Each structure stands twice: as structure tokens, then as C-alpha cells.
């Protein structure tokens, strides 16, 4: 059992997708509240996922907590009452509009969380049991592919009401019998979710622990990360089976100050470093996906990043991955010791600049980028350890 724990939005799900070279989980900020993920091996003809939905009781509990925080004047029977559900949904929408966006403020994030919780409870009411947790498979839920189920869970409301997700797929990493368990962010708003994650990591069944650390992007350590590290060190059973990963290392490739801060921090705290790793899950995963594309699809813009490239006014929004690839070629300098001679044009769009760079250079640049990401090193190290 390999359990990934860390701060919310630390990239645990994205890091897992990078290890699997697959977009299985959802990297949604402000939406992954208490959703525990399990990955297990399965034959190519036995790829399957099992979805456990939050019971009506759990939904009512989190809805009550969110309403209490949001200071909405309603009763405790709102989730069952249609009109009360509509009232609370409109109240949350008004809060979000006043705050200017779901991700703009903490109150906005929690209001949107409650809104999507109620919407999912209404949508998935038939699949939600009053007390017990309801479990279903693709055949039960009429899902034709793992991608379709991943999209269904990617939706904000479905993730809001989904409790546990157990996917099964064919991967050499899982062949040995390794189970990848992604846990809710330790700093998640729900104290119960954080407690569940802490109990899981403390669980004896946890064979290995992977701690995803934000300082690579934050420049310092969060209080929740420090608390998790202290608890890990205190727990004798798991303190000798813990590996640390610094995700979002790309931010320090061009920012020298954050970089020196990271280096000083790592030298100061972690005396041993055979279990520490630095990686860029986003870049590694996206490069792995782009390796499967060709010019007919603009190297994935029309296929992989079609959802993220469609702007509201018809202009092609630059994918985060395209922006970070251009930044990697321009300022990171990790290309600065290779045979490639990339050149970023300021008179061109980010997407078109990307198109030109990979048209001139091809897949070898993507392979060098993935090597810079360093996912393979961490994967091989953990595999050798196991």
C-alpha cells in the first residue's frame, strides 16, 4: 500500500497520473473534498473501476457544516427538501458572485463546495442510500470506458458526493501488487477528511508513504505540512517507510530566490536524502501524453488540451502546460545544456510558439523535458525499494 498524503492541491493526483502516464484522476482545485482514491492492477481486459457514493447521512453532515460556516439561515432538512436545496444553492451562488468567483475567496470556495454537494445529491439521489454507502461499477452505472468514468467523477458535483473510488487497470508498476492510495489534502476544510487521511497514513497496512511538499512553489513550509511531518516522524511504524517528493519544481527553474530557499530548507531539515525526490508531475505527465500526438492534432492541442484551449470569446486560451513549456524553453534553462537551440518568439502566441518548437525539434525535446521532470527517477527508486 503506497499512500500519497500532503497539502490540498499539492499535486498528489497529478503526480499519480504522471507515474501512471494516464489522466485517471481529476486535478480540480476547490473540489476534491474527502475523495479517497485507490489504484490496483488489472488485466487489459479487466480494466474496471468501482465508485462508492457518500451516504445521505454524510451528505447532510457536510452540508450542515458548510451552511453553518456560510451563515445561511435554513433548517437541517434542507437536502431532502427541494425548495430548501434551491434556496441554499441560490444563496451559495450569490456568495460566489459577490466574491467574484469560486476560487477568489475561502468563503467562495466553501459556498461552491456546498452548492455542488447539493447539486450532486439531487442528481445522484437514486444512487445515494439514506445511511449506508452505495457502491456501483461501470456496468451498473453504464460507463463504457475508464475515461468516461473519470470524466463523470471529474464533474464537480459527482466528486462532491462521491466517497471512495477504486480504479483497476493494467500497469507494470501495479503488477507486483502495489496499491496507490491518494488521500484528501491534509489542509482540507473538512476536519473529518483530514482525520481520515491521517488515520490511513498511520494505518499499519500502509506499506509506503509519499509526502508531496508545496515549498517548491510556496518558498516555505505550511503549518499543516509541518504537522504532518512531525506526526510521521513520531509514528515509529511508518517513519522508516516514508518518501518525500517536491512537486511543482518547475517554478524554481526560473525563480532563483525560491530555489535557494528550497535548497537551504532541504539541507537544513532532511539530513538523509536517499528518500527525497524533486519532480514536476504536470510537465512529466503532459509530456508523456504529448508523445502520443502528431502534427494533425497540433501535438495534442486539438485532442489533449481541446477542453482547456477553448476560450469564451473564441480565442484559443493557452493551456497551462503550453505556457509552462514555453517558460521551460525560455527561462528555465534546463534545455541550456543540450543540443537543442530552442527560440521563443515574443511576436507569436504561446500555443503557436509551442507548435513551432515541437515541429522543429519533435519528440526528443519532449523526452529531455520528461527527464528534467524526473518522474522516472522517483518511480525507479520506489520500485527498487519495494
Amino acid at each position: 500500500e503506497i499512500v500519497f498524503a500532503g497539502a490540498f492541491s499539492a499535486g498528489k493526483s497529478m503526480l499519480i497520473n504522471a507515474l501512471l502516464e494516464r489522466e485517471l484522476l481529476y486535478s480540480a482545485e476547490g473540489h476534491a473534498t474527502g475523495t479517497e482514491c485507490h489504484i490496483e492492477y488489472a488485466n487489459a481486459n479487466e480494466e474496471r473501476v468501482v465508485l462508492t457514493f457518500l451516504s445521505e447521512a454524510e451528505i447532510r453532515q457536510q452540508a450542515l457544516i458548510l451552511a453553518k460556516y456560510l451563515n445561511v439561515n435554513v433548517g437541517d432538512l434542507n437536502i431532502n427538501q427541494p425548495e430548501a436545496v434551491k434556496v441554499v444553492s441560490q444563496y451559495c451562488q450569490k456568495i460566489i458572485a459577490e466574491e467574484g468567483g469560486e476560487n477568489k475567496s475561502e468563503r467562495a470556495k466553501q459556498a461552491n463546495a456546498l452548492h455542488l454537494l447539493l447539486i450532486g445529491f439531487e442528481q445522484n439521489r437514486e444512487r445515494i442510500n439514506t445511511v449506508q454507502n452505495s457502491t456501483y461499477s461501470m456496468d451498473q452505472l453504464n460507463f463504457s470506458s475508464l475515461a468516461e468514468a473519470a470524466g463523470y467523477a471529474r464533474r464537480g458535483a459527482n466528486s462532491a458526493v462521491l466517497k471512495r473510488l477504486d480504479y483497476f487497470c493494467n500497469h507494470s508498476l501495479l503488477k507486483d501488487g502495489n496499491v496507490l492510495v491518494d488521500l484528501p489534502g491534509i489542509d482540507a476544510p473538512v476536519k473529518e477528511d483530514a482525520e481520515r487521511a491521517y488515520r490511513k497514513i498511520e494505518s499499519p497496512d500502509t506499506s509506503a508513504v509519499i509526502c508531496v511538499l508545496k515549498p517548491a512553489a510556496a518558498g516555505d513550509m505550511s503549518a499543516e505540512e509541518t504537522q504532518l511531518l512531525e506526526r510521521i516522524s513520531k509514528n515509529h511504524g511508518i517513519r522508516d517507510r516514508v518518501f518525500y517528493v517536491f512537486n511543482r519544481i518547475d517554478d524554481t527553474w526560473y525563480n532563483t530566490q525560491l530555489r535557494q530557499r528550497l535548497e537551504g530548507l532541504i539541507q537544513s531539515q532532511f539530513r538523509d536524502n536517499s528518500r527525497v525526490y524533486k519532480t514536476s508531475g504536470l510537465l512529466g505527465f503532459y509530456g508523456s501524453q504529448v508523445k502520443q500526438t502528431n502534427s494533425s492534432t497540433r501535438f495534442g492541442l486539438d485532442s489533449i488540451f481541446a477542453t482547456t484551449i477553448k476560450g469564451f470569446d473564441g480565442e484559443e486560451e493557452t493551456p497551462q502546460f503550453v505556457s509552462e513549456f514555453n517558460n521551460y524553453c525560455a527561462n528555465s534553462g534546463k534545455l541550456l545544456s543540450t543540443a537543442f537551440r530552442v527560440s521563443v518568439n515574443g511576436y507569436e502566441t504561446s500555443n503557436e510558439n509551442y507548435v513551432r518548437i515541437l515541429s522543429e525539434w519533435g519528440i526528443p525535446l519532449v523526452d529531455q523535458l520528461i527527464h528534467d521532470s524526473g518522474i522516472e527517477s522517483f518511480r525507479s527508486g520506489i520500485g527498487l525499494y519495494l
Binding site: W253, R259, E263, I266, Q267, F270, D272, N273, S274, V276, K278, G333, K334, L336, S337, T338, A339, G374, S377, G381
Partner: protein, 49 residues
């Protein structure tokens, strides 16, 4: 360039090998400072003033 020389055509790959050796060694990643050398290399090749 007046001082353009042939010897350091492959200086690129030598530096690459050094950084690769540093990355390969797990314990030595505590001292990892490869990217200062990278920036100095970048201003070494195709220099700009």
C-alpha cells in the same frame, strides 16, 4: 566572435554528464545547485551583453 574556439564544441555534453552524475547520486542531491552552473553556461554560450 574573435575568440570562438573548437575545443568547447562538446563542453555542453561534459556539463550534462556532470549534472547527470550529480542527479544519479541520491545523497548528493542535498548539495544540488546545478542551475547556477546552468545560468553561467547559458551566458557562456551565445553570450549577451
Amino acid at each position: 566572435m574573435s575568440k570562438i574556439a573548437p575545443q568547447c564544441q562538446n563542453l555542453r555534453e561534459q556539463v550534462n554528464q556532470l549534472i547527470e552524475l550529480l542527479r544519479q547520486e541520491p545523497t548528493l542531491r542535498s548539495q544540488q545547485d546545478t542551475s547556477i552552473v546552468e545560468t553561467a553556461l547559458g551566458k557562456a554560450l551565445s553570450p549577451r551583453f
